[PDB]
Design a protein around this ligand. Structure first.
Ligand SMILES: CC(=O)N[C@@H](CCCNCc1c(COP(=O)(O)O)cnc(C)c1O)C(=O)O
Ligand SMILES: CC(=O)N[C@@H](CCCNCc1c(COP(=O)(O)O)cnc(C)c1O)C(=O)O
Lengths: 387, 387
């Protein structure tokens, strides 16, 4: 197995910080390396494995569809597509009744940004500082992190960034020339920073007032992650465009921009598209994923465990800890120093896999099926490495 | 079944022209609608089913990897990824030895454009008229079709288009300002237009002389479609970045940007990325797809049937036929009127699903495993419908 690791490391583009280990398989919220070591996976593929590694129903759906049909374009209707369509819209407010399936989060936002422009005839986009929307050039344009943007300038214009949760700043940025505002109900890559009810409320009201669209990015907070099916249910607001990805396919590269009918209706024929978007395999996976989510109301696990976990974290007697924040099982542990050293130690010394969300934040995105015994172990592990 | 169709038609964004039928399963180059009818699939997942619908090896690989692990990021090495990397670079010339995996063709080109700006420090992009690179804002900027860009402007600048196959045009276009040239060895969406040896040759020579990068988009021409493993093999040139997708994963959403190490090396850590890009499910399907292609040298079938198919089409006695062209099984039949009505007859009266490559061109992108008898049947259907 040493050869594969070296092959991946050597042949990789080199843009990634790869860890010295080879993960071979997973079940639930546990994963194993090539040497047999077992790990608690709070990385869960960056919040993709919400339903847990090896979710039977999803796996089964993927097997049966792979045998039946995998390649079929949007020009040729195929059963799983129609099913995914009504299956996804049925768990959303009736207003969001139109879907443009894609293959990733960045593509979903790319779709949002484009439909927004075709519909309004406006060009400007408003986003929040420390907001992450994707790496493709359109999505990168509304992505704040300067170092992620500067080397590839110029990108799509014009875009205006406003401090996250700053209601008055939002109010002043959005005008009649604004095509849309794009925000995350809880900023992920930006440190796990939950939106305030007033901020999102303001974002909703402002946009309708100026004729701008509201694009809510639930690519990371979606699929029960925050405690409810979607975090926008926490704020009582309903967007014009909702973008989803990650856990949407239960692992299969899947994403979608769901929007109001008048919005989708303004898009000219052949005005946008995608080869893979809406393929039968991804459609069969999403159907399965959504049905498991709803059948088990998996968001409840996150609502119950999220608080308990964060409470334990806030109990760790360590002066290096600034704050414990998040919603559901989307948690961030902000330290008063670099988080990287501790993450490396959680892995090597405690077989615990965690992510970052900015240099001083240890982020936890465990499969929602994770058990309380593993949560206590994570806490213990953290207390340990910080001592 | 009628429920699932109206549902798909009704809940879709509406940017696609959908055919009146519902495809349920496929095998080889045959597909079945919901009423039990069988079709010869000249659409092939839109050039994605090169290895045949239901290809045993790919299906098998997907089923087994789905049971093992599907979600795992680029920061955590995983066996199938390491394998995909070495298996892919192994079927390519030695200069293309670095891999940046993604989830679609457009993502592939976006990464190509980005790595190009990061490497040359330049900004200008040169593309060809009738060229197609993708729908995401970045790829859309180097895509020709005015009506595809028109309503989404302003996009990424600065971009210069030159007439396809115009050597002197391209030469005057590429300067010390150019980060890269992006071209398809054979324009697909642009109506199936093969490059000439002299043109691609100049693109390689000019780019090197001027220090700009050559991006060869083989997303549609790749994986044996034109008669050889990759279309560049016909021309004896090696680009700086090679973008793939469509058939690369036997059906599973997958694409990739393969580049020379100096180009990969210039990308700052975390300068680019993707959640799904390089996921184990796609990596395992990509290994299987390539092994199958290499074991059967599948491209020889296109190389053998392609010319034999194109001459059969040309020999049709219809004054409506203008020209027949293509490479291997990437074929386009241009008529002296609108194709759409004819494609409709092909479907309704002959159970033959085909595509367009512009309003007057019928395009064929059949699985490479298609039988000769099925191609003979196709020709008869075309002759019949044009009477
Ligand atoms: C039915 C549909 O949606 N059609 C797509 C087109 C699909 C086929 N072309 C893809 C393609 C692409 C874009 O690849 P992707 O994102 O569709 O996977 C890039 N380069 C070349 C040479 C290509 O042929 C569209 O209109 O956007
Ligand atoms: C190491 C790596 O590749 N990580 C990615 C980031 C992954 C997680 N973020 C995804 C994301 C995206 C982009 O989605 P996708 O293309 O990765 O599927 C959009 N919106 C929100 C709220 C998101 O959280 C990167 O560095 O580009």
């Amino acid at each position: 197995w040493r050869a594969l690791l070296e092959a991946e490391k050597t042949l990789d583009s080199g843009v990634y910080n790869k860890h010295d280990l080879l993960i071979v398989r997973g079940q639930g919220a546990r994963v194993w390396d090539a040497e047999g070591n077992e790990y608690i996976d709070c990385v869960g593929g960056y919040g993709v494995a919400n339903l847990g590694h090896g979710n039977p129903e999803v796996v089964e759906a993927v097997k049966r569809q792979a045998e039946t049909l995998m390649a079929m374009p949007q020009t040729l209707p195929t059963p799983m597509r129609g099913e995914f369509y009504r299956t996804l819209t049925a768990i959303l407010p009736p207003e969001l009744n139109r879907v443009f399936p894609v293959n990733s989060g960045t593509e979903a936002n790319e779709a949002a940004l484009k439909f927004a422009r075709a519909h309004t005839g406006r060009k400007k986009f408003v986003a929040a500082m420390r907001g992450f929307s994707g790496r493709t050039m359109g999505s990168l344009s509304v992505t704040w992190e300067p170092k992620y943007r500067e080397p590839f300038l110029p990108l799509v214009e014009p875009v205006e960034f406003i401090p996250y949760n700053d209601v008055e700043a939002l109010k002043r940025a959005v005008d009649e020339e604004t095509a849309a505002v794009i925000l995350e109900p809880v900023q992920g890559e930006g440190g796990v920073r939950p939106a305030t009810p007033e901020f999102l409320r303001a974002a909703r009201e402002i946009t309708q007032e100026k004729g701008a669209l509201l694009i809510l990015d639930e690519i990371q907070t979606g699929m029960g992650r925050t405690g409810k099916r979607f975090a926008f249910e926490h704020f009582g607001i309903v967007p014009d465009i909702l973008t989803l990805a990650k856990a949407l396919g239960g692992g299969v590269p899947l994403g979608v921009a769901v929007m109001r009918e008048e919005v989708a209706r303004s898009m000219p024929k052949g005005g946008h598209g995608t080869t893979f978007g809406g393929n039968p395999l991804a459609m069969a996976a999403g159907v399965a994923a959504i049905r498991y989510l709803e059948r088990t109301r998996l968001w409840e696990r996150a609502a119950e465990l999220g608080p308990w976990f964060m409470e334990k974290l806030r109990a760790i007697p360590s002066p290096k800890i600034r704050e414990v924040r998040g919603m559901g099982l989307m948690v961030g542990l902000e330290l008063k120093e670099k988080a990287a050293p501790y993450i490396a130690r959680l892995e090597k010394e405690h077989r615990v896999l965690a992510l970052q969300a900015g240099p001083t934040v240890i982020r936890f995105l465990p499969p929602l099926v994770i058990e309380k015994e593993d949560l206590e172990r994570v806490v213990e592990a953290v207390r340990a490495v910080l001592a």
